[PDB]
Design an enzyme around this catalytic site. Structure first.
Site, PDB file in Angstrom:
ATOM      1  N   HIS A  12      13.406   2.602   0.477  1.00  0.00           N
ATOM      2  CA  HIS A  12      12.124   3.223   0.141  1.00  0.00           C
ATOM      3  C   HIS A  12      11.989   4.734   0.129  1.00  0.00           C
ATOM      4  O   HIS A  12      11.001   5.250  -0.380  1.00  0.00           O
ATOM      5  CB  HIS A  12      11.049   2.658   1.060  1.00  0.00           C
ATOM      6  N   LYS A  41      16.148  -7.271  -6.815  1.00  0.00           N
ATOM      7  CA  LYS A  41      15.096  -7.265  -5.809  1.00  0.00           C
ATOM      8  C   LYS A  41      13.844  -7.410  -6.661  1.00  0.00           C
ATOM      9  O   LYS A  41      13.601  -6.596  -7.548  1.00  0.00           O
ATOM     10  CB  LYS A  41      15.082  -5.924  -5.076  1.00  0.00           C
ATOM     11  N   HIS A 119      10.366  -1.228   7.730  1.00  0.00           N
ATOM     12  CA  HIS A 119       9.832  -2.131   6.725  1.00  0.00           C
ATOM     13  C   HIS A 119       8.653  -1.477   6.012  1.00  0.00           C
ATOM     14  O   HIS A 119       7.889  -0.721   6.616  1.00  0.00           O
ATOM     15  CB  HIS A 119       9.393  -3.435   7.396  1.00  0.00           C
ATOM     16  N   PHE A 120       8.519  -1.756   4.723  1.00  0.00           N
ATOM     17  CA  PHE A 120       7.428  -1.197   3.953  1.00  0.00           C
ATOM     18  C   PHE A 120       6.502  -2.350   3.572  1.00  0.00           C
ATOM     19  O   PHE A 120       6.824  -3.171   2.711  1.00  0.00           O
ATOM     20  CB  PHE A 120       7.975  -0.490   2.716  1.00  0.00           C
ATOM     21  N   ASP A 121       5.346  -2.394   4.223  1.00  0.00           N
ATOM     22  CA  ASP A 121       4.375  -3.452   4.022  1.00  0.00           C
ATOM     23  C   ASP A 121       3.618  -3.374   2.712  1.00  0.00           C
ATOM     24  O   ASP A 121       3.677  -4.292   1.893  1.00  0.00           O
ATOM     25  CB  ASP A 121       3.383  -3.456   5.180  1.00  0.00           C
TER      26      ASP A 121
HETATM   27 CL   LIG Z   1       8.502  -2.760  -0.992  1.00  0.00          CL
END
Ligand SMILES: [Cl-]
Ligand SMILES: [Cl-]
Ligand SMILES: [Cl-]
Length: 124
Positions: A12, A41, A119-121
């Site tokens: 990210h 992805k 993590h990217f919520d």
């Molecule tokens: Cl994402």
């Protein structure tokens, strides 16, 4: 292996640019970050802010995560973000993505020591 923090950075972070350049940005970034190495992805988000700024989010507004974990944080100000999603005509290894640029509050899951994003919520 790959630490959670390093994975988040690879998946990210994008401090080299201030915003997604052209509509081919995601096809290139998803490729160069190895997000299409073994498979495409489906969805991935890129933040166009310094690493320090994104990590700083871990000490900002603490909000609930989508899964219900109480370790998510929302950036106080909006950030330059790019949403990359597979297009209807995307098949491994020919992954194709749609680039949607915007300025939204980043929401990341943080953990570990140092307390960094892993993590990217979402983006709101
Ligand atoms: Cl994402
Ligand atoms: Cl690593
Ligand atoms: Cl890699």
């Amino acid at each position: 292996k790959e630490t959670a923090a390093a994975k988040f950075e690879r998946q990210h972070m994008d401090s080299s640019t201030s915003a997604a350049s052209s509509s081919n940005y995601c096809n290139q970034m998803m490729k160069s970050r190895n997000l299409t190495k073994d498979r495409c992805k489906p969805v991935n988000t890129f933040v166009h802010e310094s690493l320090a700024d994104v990590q700083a989010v871990c000490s900002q507004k603490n909000v609930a995560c989508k899964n219900g974990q109480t370790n998510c944080y929302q950036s106080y100000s909006t950030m330059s973000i790019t949403d990359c999603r597979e297009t209807g005509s995307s098949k491994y290894p020919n992954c194709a993505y749609k680039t949607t640029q915007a300025n939204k509050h980043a929401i990341v899951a943080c953990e570990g020591n140092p307390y960094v994003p892993v993590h990217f919520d979402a983006s709101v």
